[PDB]
């Protein structure tokens, strides 16, 4: 009955030095000590170059094992290093979740000359040219792997489209391969959002349907995975992704394989439509809660803190909510830049770590810092919040989201976790106090601030109430001294 806590074990700007798998393995016992129970590791297969973060997917059967793209290792290291790291996580009781990129492929071995039409980038259902022959990056043969594990080769007729004609080099185009149709259902932004980048996989094609299930089975088996992080699920045929997840569970013996999808949309309704169309079979990153954390941070005291959880997965669908403050895309300089400022970050982490709703995900970029962007490591204060979650965030919750600035909640504690119970209080503005119910069983106990932000103590009265303060623009988490 211990709380679960995920860590995203990478950030965008890590050096291309083939050390991440070695570090992850060495970190396992430390991650266990701070309460991390699952690790999301980056795309572990060969990208279009050695330095690829992993999203520019070339060969999903090359886990840093084959001489392809001028390298054996990936950015992160070798197959054997990743396997050793997962053995070390499992030796420490930590789940391993592999990033799974199924939308597209990049770094084709060869061009193919194929018939295509242009479509409106704002309305991909609208054809805007006659048919003509383009030079497309659609031929994937993987000669460096030489058919090891899989003889499957990719050609144009397994893709729906590309955004580049190597023969004409025109910018701002999207090409639909002749005879192909955008997959459905996908997100309807730009009319049909199947196409994102690269060579867009055709999930209408039955050879592709079979092959990508076969790959999924091989990947989970090969690395003995507990779960998957599914990339760009709003751009992949909804009913196929649902079928893919059922198939891998059934074939790998991983009947309860954990799945969290990235459906990047700021409106809850989009995430609810996805869950509806995939039978509520997977969790989703709580993108709306991340936007709420950004709006509060960016409001400089004037945000209404009563609204912090509104229109979120965490409030509305907590079983399926993977809550986060920042990720590799929201960090400075990246594609979804929407960074939660240092001052607010502890309030955001206290929200996801001490509440009963959601599966929180700690960002590597927050814990260990982002030196290339002058982002300080936050591990010193994160370790105290993670202690709050590991040891104290148990039992019945009472919410006091009843002030524009000062909000809080309590956990009563449960018998399985000795000394458990807490009161979280926080302000986006001036400091304040909240009288909150931690439980009559705490009557006469003295509470301290496990964050160390406050050095005063709080005595629980006989009615099970304390008056819990915080500093301005700060959080305190009150536990039994
Ligand atoms: C980053 C997220 O993008 C999408 O988000 C959209 C929203 O959906 C939309 O509503 C609105 O908010 O705009 C957003 C930004 O566009 C997407 O929905 C979401 O799933 C994405 N996060 C995921 C997905 C991916 C992709 O798998 C990850 O993306 C990251 O890695 C990308 C690939 O390296 C990188 O893309 C940039 O670089 C590539 C190289 C380039 N592609 C061209 C280049 C080549 C070969 O070099 C050829 O293949 C073609 O000519 C081109 O397609 C892109 O043009 C460029 O954008 C991306 O920056 C990076 O974020 C992401 O990490 C996941 O978490
Ligand atoms: O932390 C390991 C834990 O992860 C998953 O449990 C999730 C669950 O699926 C979600 O619905 C939500 O409540 O968060 C849980 C994590 O606390 C795995 O399914 C589970 O087996 C595993 O122990
Ligand atoms: O150092 C320059 C900037 O770095 C960003 O990542 C921060 O959020 C800013 O508040 C800061 O001013
Ligand atoms: O929003 C556009 C979508 O409308 C419909 O559902 C069509 O079946 C689909 O092919 C199309 O892309
Ligand atoms: O959303 C606008 C900007 O808001 C904040 O300043 C964020 O730190 C930055 O990442 C984002 O780009
Ligand atoms: Ca697609
Ligand atoms: Ca199609
Ligand atoms: Ca406020
Ligand atoms: Na497609």
Residue numbers in the entry: 4 to 484
What did the authors write?
Here, we report the three-dimensional structure of a ‘Termamyl’-like α-amylase, the AliC α-amylase from Alicyclobacillus sp. 18711. One particularly important subset of GH13 enzymes are the ‘Termamyl’-like α-amylases, historically named after an enzyme from Bacillus licheniformis. These enzymes typically feature a three-domain ‘A, B, C’ arrangement with a C-terminal β-sheet domain and with domain B being a protrusion from the (β/α)8 fold of domain A. The catalytic centre is placed in domain A, whilst the A–B interface forms the substrate-binding cleft. The fold, as expected, is a canonical three-domain arrangement with the A, B and C domains defined approximately as A, residues 4–104 and 210–397; B, residues 105–209; and C, residues 398–484. A classical Ca2+–Na+–Ca2+ triad is found at the A/B-domain interface.
